[PDB]
């Protein structure tokens, strides 16, 4: 199958500020032969929603066409429908929820007609996870197995529930749509029960758009904002989540934020830590920080410098036939070094270790 001989560690970053928000993001192809993730990051929405922002991560599969179309138009499909609009003053929570549901269903059908029309040869599909942030609500949006979480008061206040085929209701639908869930896959093939695209799984005659083997229907949750307590939001594809849990990642990002305010760097650190933890998938993260996101701490920066220096000395002593990096990491791990980044652990310190190793054993 895919898998490069070596991972494409090139980071594609972006950052911005506006509407009281700050953000950074990182996308990296990793070990996969192709890059099928995509994203949207926008502060200030058109048509009278300049106070609104929108961020989303798309994990494409069997191609990037659906993911890419989604990242450039899922938003307008959401905001530009009669349900979201619901012509009145500002959109009510229901307008926003209905607007999003319709946006998903409409862009799905819309891509389907384009494909049928132009004899599209791809059979790709994509997940979508994001947040629609208004001046008073963050509406989490989920469709698939990508995941998002809101850290509030140093804790995981909310996180999206991944749509897996064996989930009771998904399984129910799948079976009623004539399919079966074999272990964790729709008919032994698809590992997600919801996604846009995957039109071959949406041909069950006698079933609605949301009653097919794979559903384009999103789960939306309205969370009232808290200026005082809202810290940050993390949106990432399963390439991240496969190897780091909710509180681990949350704890990890906090530790990195106490050390830097460069949100692109924090995202790169999450991606490399997950690659070092063994993720062999495309990886994408969007970190959106609120006014009360943790701040850089002088003592935290000190402890980091101390740890980096300490790790460099260990390598010097360990490297001494001169063991390969794989083995130096092995030694370091058996030493059970204290004060390693929470959640990220030694893997989050691999670039420091490897940089020293490289200076000492350049050939
Ligand atoms: Mn993919
Ligand atoms: Mn993935």
mmCIF file of C-alpha atoms and ligand atoms in Angstrom:
data_model
loop_
_atom_site.group_PDB
_atom_site.id
_atom_site.type_symbol
_atom_site.label_atom_id
_atom_site.label_comp_id
_atom_site.label_asym_id
_atom_site.label_seq_id
_atom_site.Cartn_x
_atom_site.Cartn_y
_atom_site.Cartn_z
ATOM 1 C CA UNK A 1 0.000 0.000 0.000
ATOM 2 C CA UNK A 2 1.141 3.590 0.612
ATOM 3 C CA UNK A 3 3.958 4.468 3.065
ATOM 4 C CA UNK A 4 7.049 6.302 1.917
ATOM 5 C CA UNK A 5 10.527 4.928 2.681
ATOM 6 C CA UNK A 6 10.895 7.994 4.907
ATOM 7 C CA UNK A 7 8.148 10.416 6.009
ATOM 8 C CA UNK A 8 7.675 13.814 4.374
ATOM 9 C CA UNK A 9 8.168 15.883 7.509
ATOM 10 C CA UNK A 10 7.550 19.159 5.674
ATOM 11 C CA UNK A 11 5.180 21.335 7.703
ATOM 12 C CA UNK A 12 2.618 23.534 6.038
ATOM 13 C CA UNK A 13 1.690 26.232 8.534
ATOM 14 C CA UNK A 14 -0.621 29.180 8.882
ATOM 15 C CA UNK A 15 -1.600 31.599 11.617
ATOM 16 C CA UNK A 16 -3.771 34.589 12.214
ATOM 17 C CA UNK A 17 -5.416 36.834 14.748
ATOM 18 C CA UNK A 18 -8.781 38.598 14.869
ATOM 19 C CA UNK A 19 -12.108 38.755 16.729
ATOM 20 C CA UNK A 20 -10.228 38.199 19.977
ATOM 21 C CA UNK A 21 -8.814 34.963 18.561
ATOM 22 C CA UNK A 22 -5.314 33.810 17.591
ATOM 23 C CA UNK A 23 -4.531 30.621 15.750
ATOM 24 C CA UNK A 24 -1.837 28.484 14.199
ATOM 25 C CA UNK A 25 -2.047 25.267 12.221
ATOM 26 C CA UNK A 26 0.205 22.564 10.873
ATOM 27 C CA UNK A 27 -0.315 19.993 8.150
ATOM 28 C CA UNK A 28 2.254 17.291 7.441
ATOM 29 C CA UNK A 29 2.101 14.387 5.019
ATOM 30 C CA UNK A 30 4.088 12.028 7.266
ATOM 31 C CA UNK A 31 4.547 8.400 6.135
ATOM 32 C CA UNK A 32 1.705 8.384 3.637
ATOM 33 C CA UNK A 33 2.437 8.483 -0.083
ATOM 34 C CA UNK A 34 -0.216 11.155 -0.721
ATOM 35 C CA UNK A 35 -1.537 14.038 1.359
ATOM 36 C CA UNK A 36 -5.296 13.854 1.712
ATOM 37 C CA UNK A 37 -6.021 16.183 4.629
ATOM 38 C CA UNK A 38 -7.232 19.754 4.104
ATOM 39 C CA UNK A 39 -8.478 22.592 6.334
ATOM 40 C CA UNK A 40 -10.190 25.936 6.534
ATOM 41 C CA UNK A 41 -9.110 28.719 8.912
ATOM 42 C CA UNK A 42 -10.947 31.988 8.632
ATOM 43 C CA UNK A 43 -11.585 34.877 10.988
ATOM 44 C CA UNK A 44 -14.461 37.100 9.927
ATOM 45 C CA UNK A 45 -17.205 35.596 7.791
ATOM 46 C CA UNK A 46 -18.841 37.313 4.823
ATOM 47 C CA UNK A 47 -22.546 38.307 4.527
ATOM 48 C CA UNK A 48 -22.739 40.012 7.905
ATOM 49 C CA UNK A 49 -20.735 37.561 10.027
ATOM 50 C CA UNK A 50 -17.467 39.467 10.262
ATOM 51 C CA UNK A 51 -17.604 38.791 14.005
ATOM 52 C CA UNK A 52 -17.766 35.061 13.269
ATOM 53 C CA UNK A 53 -14.746 32.796 12.520
ATOM 54 C CA UNK A 54 -14.593 29.277 11.091
ATOM 55 C CA UNK A 55 -12.003 26.536 11.406
ATOM 56 C CA UNK A 56 -12.272 22.897 10.168
ATOM 57 C CA UNK A 57 -10.036 19.900 9.402
ATOM 58 C CA UNK A 58 -10.884 17.490 6.601
ATOM 59 C CA UNK A 59 -9.394 14.011 6.499
ATOM 60 C CA UNK A 60 -9.862 12.810 2.930
ATOM 61 C CA UNK A 61 -9.748 9.134 1.990
ATOM 62 C CA UNK A 62 -9.408 7.329 -1.343
ATOM 63 C CA UNK A 63 -8.379 10.740 -2.678
ATOM 64 C CA UNK A 64 -8.228 14.452 -1.740
ATOM 65 C CA UNK A 65 -10.898 15.808 -4.105
ATOM 66 C CA UNK A 66 -13.739 15.752 -1.587
ATOM 67 C CA UNK A 67 -11.554 17.078 1.236
ATOM 68 C CA UNK A 68 -10.264 19.911 -0.973
ATOM 69 C CA UNK A 69 -13.663 20.882 -2.314
ATOM 70 C CA UNK A 70 -14.919 20.885 1.265
ATOM 71 C CA UNK A 71 -12.162 23.147 2.535
ATOM 72 C CA UNK A 72 -13.092 25.866 0.047
ATOM 73 C CA UNK A 73 -16.861 25.632 0.095
ATOM 74 C CA UNK A 74 -18.235 23.883 3.099
ATOM 75 C CA UNK A 75 -18.572 27.313 4.721
ATOM 76 C CA UNK A 76 -20.559 29.061 2.059
ATOM 77 C CA UNK A 77 -22.807 26.051 1.745
ATOM 78 C CA UNK A 78 -23.436 26.373 5.478
ATOM 79 C CA UNK A 79 -24.035 30.154 5.655
ATOM 80 C CA UNK A 80 -25.762 30.452 2.284
ATOM 81 C CA UNK A 81 -28.923 28.421 2.765
ATOM 82 C CA UNK A 82 -32.411 29.394 3.890
ATOM 83 C CA UNK A 83 -32.083 27.538 7.216
ATOM 84 C CA UNK A 84 -28.934 29.278 8.374
ATOM 85 C CA UNK A 85 -30.319 32.540 7.146
ATOM 86 C CA UNK A 86 -33.881 32.017 8.329
ATOM 87 C CA UNK A 87 -34.340 35.689 7.450
ATOM 88 C CA UNK A 88 -34.733 37.603 10.715
ATOM 89 C CA UNK A 89 -32.120 39.375 12.815
ATOM 90 C CA UNK A 90 -29.088 37.280 13.728
ATOM 91 C CA UNK A 91 -29.311 33.478 13.266
ATOM 92 C CA UNK A 92 -30.805 31.636 16.242
ATOM 93 C CA UNK A 93 -29.030 28.558 17.621
ATOM 94 C CA UNK A 94 -31.492 26.427 15.634
ATOM 95 C CA UNK A 95 -30.834 28.443 12.427
ATOM 96 C CA UNK A 96 -27.174 27.770 12.906
ATOM 97 C CA UNK A 97 -27.681 24.044 13.638
ATOM 98 C CA UNK A 98 -30.166 23.533 10.793
ATOM 99 C CA UNK A 99 -28.012 25.709 8.555
ATOM 100 C CA UNK A 100 -25.017 23.440 9.179
ATOM 101 C CA UNK A 101 -26.988 20.216 8.660
ATOM 102 C CA UNK A 102 -28.343 21.564 5.348
ATOM 103 C CA UNK A 103 -24.898 22.830 4.378
ATOM 104 C CA UNK A 104 -23.535 19.305 4.751
ATOM 105 C CA UNK A 105 -26.362 17.611 2.897
ATOM 106 C CA UNK A 106 -26.371 20.215 0.134
ATOM 107 C CA UNK A 107 -22.654 20.265 -0.553
ATOM 108 C CA UNK A 108 -22.693 16.444 -0.579
ATOM 109 C CA UNK A 109 -25.464 16.234 -3.167
ATOM 110 C CA UNK A 110 -23.819 19.140 -4.989
ATOM 111 C CA UNK A 111 -20.500 17.266 -5.287
ATOM 112 C CA UNK A 112 -22.459 14.182 -6.329
ATOM 113 C CA UNK A 113 -24.105 15.984 -9.261
ATOM 114 C CA UNK A 114 -20.785 17.484 -10.336
ATOM 115 C CA UNK A 115 -19.226 14.036 -10.325
ATOM 116 C CA UNK A 116 -22.094 12.417 -12.234
ATOM 117 C CA UNK A 117 -22.111 15.370 -14.660
ATOM 118 C CA UNK A 118 -18.370 15.407 -15.394
ATOM 119 C CA UNK A 119 -18.003 11.610 -15.118
ATOM 120 C CA UNK A 120 -15.785 12.012 -12.077
ATOM 121 C CA UNK A 121 -13.489 9.075 -11.690
ATOM 122 C CA UNK A 122 -12.571 9.542 -8.073
ATOM 123 C CA UNK A 123 -14.302 7.697 -5.321
ATOM 124 C CA UNK A 124 -12.924 9.756 -2.437
ATOM 125 C CA UNK A 125 -14.639 10.831 0.736
ATOM 126 C CA UNK A 126 -13.768 13.050 3.674
ATOM 127 C CA UNK A 127 -14.485 13.684 7.311
ATOM 128 C CA UNK A 128 -15.028 17.206 8.595
ATOM 129 C CA UNK A 129 -14.632 18.600 12.105
ATOM 130 C CA UNK A 130 -14.658 22.288 12.962
ATOM 131 C CA UNK A 131 -15.978 25.177 15.031
ATOM 132 C CA UNK A 132 -18.226 28.032 13.947
ATOM 133 C CA UNK A 133 -17.406 30.756 16.501
ATOM 134 C CA UNK A 134 -19.874 33.586 17.020
ATOM 135 C CA UNK A 135 -19.443 36.375 19.505
ATOM 136 C CA UNK A 136 -21.258 34.250 22.109
ATOM 137 C CA UNK A 137 -21.093 30.590 21.006
ATOM 138 C CA UNK A 138 -18.703 28.049 19.661
ATOM 139 C CA UNK A 139 -20.668 25.534 17.641
ATOM 140 C CA UNK A 140 -18.668 22.351 17.324
ATOM 141 C CA UNK A 141 -19.212 20.533 14.065
ATOM 142 C CA UNK A 142 -18.524 16.829 13.503
ATOM 143 C CA UNK A 143 -18.925 14.348 10.719
ATOM 144 C CA UNK A 144 -16.545 11.396 10.872
ATOM 145 C CA UNK A 145 -13.586 10.411 12.978
ATOM 146 C CA UNK A 146 -11.605 13.614 13.035
ATOM 147 C CA UNK A 147 -11.985 15.232 16.500
ATOM 148 C CA UNK A 148 -12.181 18.580 18.226
ATOM 149 C CA UNK A 149 -12.047 19.599 21.863
ATOM 150 C CA UNK A 150 -12.524 22.767 23.897
ATOM 151 C CA UNK A 151 -10.180 23.307 26.842
ATOM 152 C CA UNK A 152 -11.799 25.459 29.514
ATOM 153 C CA UNK A 153 -10.306 26.129 32.927
ATOM 154 C CA UNK A 154 -7.359 23.823 32.180
ATOM 155 C CA UNK A 155 -9.719 20.909 31.516
ATOM 156 C CA UNK A 156 -11.395 19.245 28.532
ATOM 157 C CA UNK A 157 -14.756 20.986 28.657
ATOM 158 C CA UNK A 158 -16.072 19.294 25.531
ATOM 159 C CA UNK A 159 -14.912 16.977 22.763
ATOM 160 C CA UNK A 160 -16.586 15.573 19.677
ATOM 161 C CA UNK A 161 -17.723 11.945 19.564
ATOM 162 C CA UNK A 162 -16.136 10.065 16.645
ATOM 163 C CA UNK A 163 -18.507 8.393 14.199
ATOM 164 C CA UNK A 164 -17.333 4.763 14.096
ATOM 165 C CA UNK A 165 -19.359 2.063 12.237
ATOM 166 C CA UNK A 166 -19.724 -0.163 15.316
ATOM 167 C CA UNK A 167 -21.326 2.689 17.278
ATOM 168 C CA UNK A 168 -24.859 1.380 18.083
ATOM 169 C CA UNK A 169 -26.814 3.859 16.015
ATOM 170 C CA UNK A 170 -24.365 3.885 13.078
ATOM 171 C CA UNK A 171 -24.439 0.099 13.044
ATOM 172 C CA UNK A 172 -28.226 0.288 13.192
ATOM 173 C CA UNK A 173 -28.385 2.529 10.162
ATOM 174 C CA UNK A 174 -25.775 0.531 8.273
ATOM 175 C CA UNK A 175 -27.678 -2.727 8.852
ATOM 176 C CA UNK A 176 -30.983 -1.159 7.940
ATOM 177 C CA UNK A 177 -29.368 0.243 4.800
ATOM 178 C CA UNK A 178 -28.627 -3.345 3.841
ATOM 179 C CA UNK A 179 -25.022 -3.331 5.007
ATOM 180 C CA UNK A 180 -22.999 -4.945 7.778
ATOM 181 C CA UNK A 181 -20.313 -3.838 10.196
ATOM 182 C CA UNK A 182 -17.428 -6.312 10.059
ATOM 183 C CA UNK A 183 -15.234 -5.758 13.128
ATOM 184 C CA UNK A 184 -14.875 -1.936 12.736
ATOM 185 C CA UNK A 185 -15.712 -1.486 9.037
ATOM 186 C CA UNK A 186 -18.777 -0.926 6.874
ATOM 187 C CA UNK A 187 -18.831 -4.159 4.884
ATOM 188 C CA UNK A 188 -15.241 -4.793 5.896
ATOM 189 C CA UNK A 189 -13.977 -1.696 4.090
ATOM 190 C CA UNK A 190 -14.880 1.753 5.475
ATOM 191 C CA UNK A 191 -13.725 2.671 8.981
ATOM 192 C CA UNK A 192 -16.024 5.731 9.309
ATOM 193 C CA UNK A 193 -19.803 5.743 9.326
ATOM 194 C CA UNK A 194 -20.121 9.398 8.342
ATOM 195 C CA UNK A 195 -18.341 11.495 5.763
ATOM 196 C CA UNK A 196 -19.023 13.544 2.696
ATOM 197 C CA UNK A 197 -18.320 11.816 -0.599
ATOM 198 C CA UNK A 198 -18.174 8.000 -0.671
ATOM 199 C CA UNK A 199 -21.119 8.026 -3.095
ATOM 200 C CA UNK A 200 -20.974 4.268 -3.725
ATOM 201 C CA UNK A 201 -22.091 3.852 -0.135
ATOM 202 C CA UNK A 202 -24.958 6.234 -0.735
ATOM 203 C CA UNK A 203 -26.908 4.320 -3.385
ATOM 204 C CA UNK A 204 -29.310 2.345 -1.185
ATOM 205 C CA UNK A 205 -32.670 2.610 -2.904
ATOM 206 C CA UNK A 206 -35.483 3.174 -0.463
ATOM 207 C CA UNK A 207 -33.347 5.143 2.000
ATOM 208 C CA UNK A 208 -32.947 8.850 2.589
ATOM 209 C CA UNK A 209 -29.657 10.802 2.334
ATOM 210 C CA UNK A 210 -29.140 10.265 6.035
ATOM 211 C CA UNK A 211 -30.132 6.578 5.995
ATOM 212 C CA UNK A 212 -27.476 5.259 3.597
ATOM 213 C CA UNK A 213 -24.498 3.057 4.533
ATOM 214 C CA UNK A 214 -22.376 6.217 5.042
ATOM 215 C CA UNK A 215 -24.058 9.398 6.280
ATOM 216 C CA UNK A 216 -23.213 13.041 5.439
ATOM 217 C CA UNK A 217 -25.139 14.172 8.526
ATOM 218 C CA UNK A 218 -23.111 16.215 11.094
ATOM 219 C CA UNK A 219 -23.413 16.440 14.873
ATOM 220 C CA UNK A 220 -23.528 20.025 16.132
ATOM 221 C CA UNK A 221 -23.142 21.259 19.670
ATOM 222 C CA UNK A 222 -23.713 24.761 20.833
ATOM 223 C CA UNK A 223 -21.354 25.819 23.667
ATOM 224 C CA UNK A 224 -21.838 29.293 25.164
ATOM 225 C CA UNK A 225 -18.573 31.128 25.279
ATOM 226 C CA UNK A 226 -16.885 32.106 28.519
ATOM 227 C CA UNK A 227 -14.452 35.016 28.128
ATOM 228 C CA UNK A 228 -12.952 34.246 31.498
ATOM 229 C CA UNK A 229 -12.604 30.483 31.180
ATOM 230 C CA UNK A 230 -12.275 29.590 27.490
ATOM 231 C CA UNK A 231 -8.632 28.790 26.784
ATOM 232 C CA UNK A 232 -8.179 26.981 23.465
ATOM 233 C CA UNK A 233 -9.725 24.694 20.881
ATOM 234 C CA UNK A 234 -7.935 21.849 19.107
ATOM 235 C CA UNK A 235 -9.178 20.401 15.816
ATOM 236 C CA UNK A 236 -7.183 17.468 14.405
ATOM 237 C CA UNK A 237 -7.544 14.427 12.145
ATOM 238 C CA UNK A 238 -7.240 10.889 13.590
ATOM 239 C CA UNK A 239 -3.550 10.975 12.612
ATOM 240 C CA UNK A 240 -3.171 13.023 15.790
ATOM 241 C CA UNK A 241 -5.868 11.382 17.897
ATOM 242 C CA UNK A 242 -4.746 7.846 17.028
ATOM 243 C CA UNK A 243 -1.738 8.306 19.220
ATOM 244 C CA UNK A 244 -2.633 10.952 21.852
ATOM 245 C CA UNK A 245 -5.716 11.134 24.008
ATOM 246 C CA UNK A 246 -7.904 14.152 24.768
ATOM 247 C CA UNK A 247 -6.469 15.118 28.138
ATOM 248 C CA UNK A 248 -2.912 14.140 27.115
ATOM 249 C CA UNK A 249 -2.997 16.422 24.098
ATOM 250 C CA UNK A 250 -4.780 19.131 26.049
ATOM 251 C CA UNK A 251 -2.159 18.862 28.836
ATOM 252 C CA UNK A 252 0.641 18.758 26.268
ATOM 253 C CA UNK A 253 -0.504 21.859 24.415
ATOM 254 C CA UNK A 254 -0.854 23.724 27.722
ATOM 255 C CA UNK A 255 2.770 22.873 28.555
ATOM 256 C CA UNK A 256 3.913 24.102 25.131
ATOM 257 C CA UNK A 257 1.857 27.261 25.456
ATOM 258 C CA UNK A 258 3.500 28.009 28.798
ATOM 259 C CA UNK A 259 6.720 27.967 26.811
ATOM 260 C CA UNK A 260 5.776 29.740 23.537
ATOM 261 C CA UNK A 261 3.089 31.908 21.983
ATOM 262 C CA UNK A 262 4.097 30.906 18.469
ATOM 263 C CA UNK A 263 1.009 28.882 17.641
ATOM 264 C CA UNK A 264 2.527 27.460 14.427
ATOM 265 C CA UNK A 265 5.421 26.081 16.477
ATOM 266 C CA UNK A 266 3.048 24.559 19.030
ATOM 267 C CA UNK A 267 1.205 22.793 16.192
ATOM 268 C CA UNK A 268 4.484 21.536 14.642
ATOM 269 C CA UNK A 269 5.436 20.186 18.040
ATOM 270 C CA UNK A 270 2.139 18.299 18.285
ATOM 271 C CA UNK A 271 2.601 16.821 14.791
ATOM 272 C CA UNK A 272 6.213 15.698 15.356
ATOM 273 C CA UNK A 273 5.367 14.291 18.766
ATOM 274 C CA UNK A 274 2.585 12.214 17.159
ATOM 275 C CA UNK A 275 4.874 11.093 14.326
ATOM 276 C CA UNK A 276 7.452 10.100 16.965
ATOM 277 C CA UNK A 277 4.739 8.308 18.902
ATOM 278 C CA UNK A 278 4.240 6.226 15.781
ATOM 279 C CA UNK A 279 1.520 7.882 13.739
ATOM 280 C CA UNK A 280 1.935 6.895 10.104
ATOM 281 C CA UNK A 281 -0.934 8.914 8.763
ATOM 282 C CA UNK A 282 -1.334 12.425 7.355
ATOM 283 C CA UNK A 283 -1.547 14.867 10.314
ATOM 284 C CA UNK A 284 -3.343 18.220 10.612
ATOM 285 C CA UNK A 285 -3.960 20.393 13.700
ATOM 286 C CA UNK A 286 -5.589 23.783 14.221
ATOM 287 C CA UNK A 287 -4.990 25.456 17.599
ATOM 288 C CA UNK A 288 -7.318 28.394 18.265
ATOM 289 C CA UNK A 289 -6.509 30.288 21.451
ATOM 290 C CA UNK A 290 -8.893 32.601 23.337
ATOM 291 C CA UNK A 291 -7.935 35.639 25.489
ATOM 292 C CA UNK A 292 -7.366 33.500 28.591
ATOM 293 C CA UNK A 293 -5.329 30.799 26.895
ATOM 294 C CA UNK A 294 -2.330 29.929 29.017
ATOM 295 C CA UNK A 295 0.532 32.489 28.822
ATOM 296 C CA UNK A 296 4.296 32.092 28.456
ATOM 297 C CA UNK A 297 5.889 31.470 31.835
ATOM 298 C CA UNK A 298 9.461 32.509 32.621
ATOM 299 C CA UNK A 299 9.888 29.543 34.955
ATOM 300 C CA UNK A 300 8.431 27.182 32.337
ATOM 301 C CA UNK A 301 10.857 28.458 29.723
ATOM 302 C CA UNK A 302 13.671 27.959 32.297
ATOM 303 C CA UNK A 303 12.679 24.400 33.097
ATOM 304 C CA UNK A 304 12.560 23.746 29.344
ATOM 305 C CA UNK A 305 16.084 25.094 28.827
ATOM 306 C CA UNK A 306 17.280 23.036 31.805
ATOM 307 C CA UNK A 307 15.674 19.893 30.405
ATOM 308 C CA UNK A 308 17.110 20.448 26.954
ATOM 309 C CA UNK A 309 20.608 20.953 28.399
ATOM 310 C CA UNK A 310 20.163 17.898 30.592
ATOM 311 C CA UNK A 311 19.061 15.807 27.610
ATOM 312 C CA UNK A 312 22.085 17.006 25.616
ATOM 313 C CA UNK A 313 24.501 15.888 28.352
ATOM 314 C CA UNK A 314 22.850 12.503 28.635
ATOM 315 C CA UNK A 315 23.340 12.012 24.886
ATOM 316 C CA UNK A 316 26.973 13.066 25.160
ATOM 317 C CA UNK A 317 27.619 10.509 27.889
ATOM 318 C CA UNK A 318 25.540 7.751 26.257
ATOM 319 C CA UNK A 319 26.912 8.158 22.732
ATOM 320 C CA UNK A 320 30.113 7.543 24.743
ATOM 321 C CA UNK A 321 30.921 1.849 19.144
ATOM 322 C CA UNK A 322 28.504 4.800 19.038
ATOM 323 C CA UNK A 323 24.862 3.587 19.140
ATOM 324 C CA UNK A 324 22.336 4.673 16.564
ATOM 325 C CA UNK A 325 19.659 7.237 17.582
ATOM 326 C CA UNK A 326 17.105 4.461 17.942
ATOM 327 C CA UNK A 327 19.273 3.056 20.700
ATOM 328 C CA UNK A 328 20.037 6.384 22.337
ATOM 329 C CA UNK A 329 16.297 6.969 22.587
ATOM 330 C CA UNK A 330 16.009 3.453 24.062
ATOM 331 C CA UNK A 331 18.570 4.221 26.753
ATOM 332 C CA UNK A 332 17.038 7.618 27.537
ATOM 333 C CA UNK A 333 13.668 5.966 27.992
ATOM 334 C CA UNK A 334 14.942 3.345 30.443
ATOM 335 C CA UNK A 335 16.367 6.162 32.526
ATOM 336 C CA UNK A 336 12.841 7.317 33.259
ATOM 337 C CA UNK A 337 13.836 10.995 33.159
ATOM 338 C CA UNK A 338 11.610 13.271 35.314
ATOM 339 C CA UNK A 339 9.863 16.388 34.123
ATOM 340 C CA UNK A 340 9.244 15.401 30.507
ATOM 341 C CA UNK A 341 6.363 17.265 28.819
ATOM 342 C CA UNK A 342 3.035 15.843 30.035
ATOM 343 C CA UNK A 343 1.363 13.788 27.323
ATOM 344 C CA UNK A 344 4.179 14.401 24.850
ATOM 345 C CA UNK A 345 6.725 12.589 27.031
ATOM 346 C CA UNK A 346 10.114 11.603 25.492
ATOM 347 C CA UNK A 347 8.680 11.654 21.955
ATOM 348 C CA UNK A 348 8.017 15.389 22.410
ATOM 349 C CA UNK A 349 11.747 15.799 23.205
ATOM 350 C CA UNK A 350 13.028 13.735 20.246
ATOM 351 C CA UNK A 351 13.977 16.718 18.082
ATOM 352 C CA UNK A 352 16.191 18.101 20.896
ATOM 353 C CA UNK A 353 17.791 14.662 21.338
ATOM 354 C CA UNK A 354 18.224 14.105 17.633
ATOM 355 C CA UNK A 355 19.735 17.568 17.101
ATOM 356 C CA UNK A 356 22.439 16.887 19.722
ATOM 357 C CA UNK A 357 22.998 13.370 18.381
ATOM 358 C CA UNK A 358 23.454 14.882 14.915
ATOM 359 C CA UNK A 359 26.127 17.338 16.077
ATOM 360 C CA UNK A 360 28.008 14.482 17.819
ATOM 361 C CA UNK A 361 27.601 11.836 15.073
ATOM 362 C CA UNK A 362 27.166 13.870 11.856
ATOM 363 C CA UNK A 363 28.059 10.919 9.596
HETATM 364 MN MN1 LIG B 1 -7.021 10.120 4.777
HETATM 365 MN MN1 LIG B 2 -6.484 9.906 8.719
#
